[PDB]
């Protein structure tokens, strides 16, 4: 019965180790996701939460009809 059907204890053991490693990495990355999102919204120096502003290509630098501008 053990030869034909059952998984070896070595196989199940190392499978458990791999599952533990993968899920621990995912948990750490999720915690870093929450902290990075909090810091980025609190500071605003990152690519995320880059709220739009007025483009500076619309500024006309040509000389006008009035010298005071």
């Amino acid at each position: 019965i053990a030869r034909t059907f059952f998984d070896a204890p070595e196989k199940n053991y190392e499978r458990t180790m791999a599952i533990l490693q993968i899920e621990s990495e995912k948990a750490e990355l999720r915690l870093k996701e929450l902290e990075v999102r909090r810091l980025m919204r609190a500071k605003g120096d990152g690519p995320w939460f880059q709220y739009p502003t007025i483009d500076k290509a619309l500024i006309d630098h040509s000389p006008k009809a009035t010298p005071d501008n």
Binding site: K26, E33, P47
Partner: protein
Amino acid sequence: GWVRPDLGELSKVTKVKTDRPLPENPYHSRARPEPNPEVEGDLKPARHGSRLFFWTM
């Protein structure tokens, strides 16, 4: 001996042999704020899929 200019002669753009320096800061502005850093590096794939709840991929 003064000649009256014709039509459009006074409306030409001219050049002036001046000696005053060009004002480098005519608008009395200040230092510009530092822009955000850009994105650099290759697009590596996502680590272990979407990492959203039980979805492995």
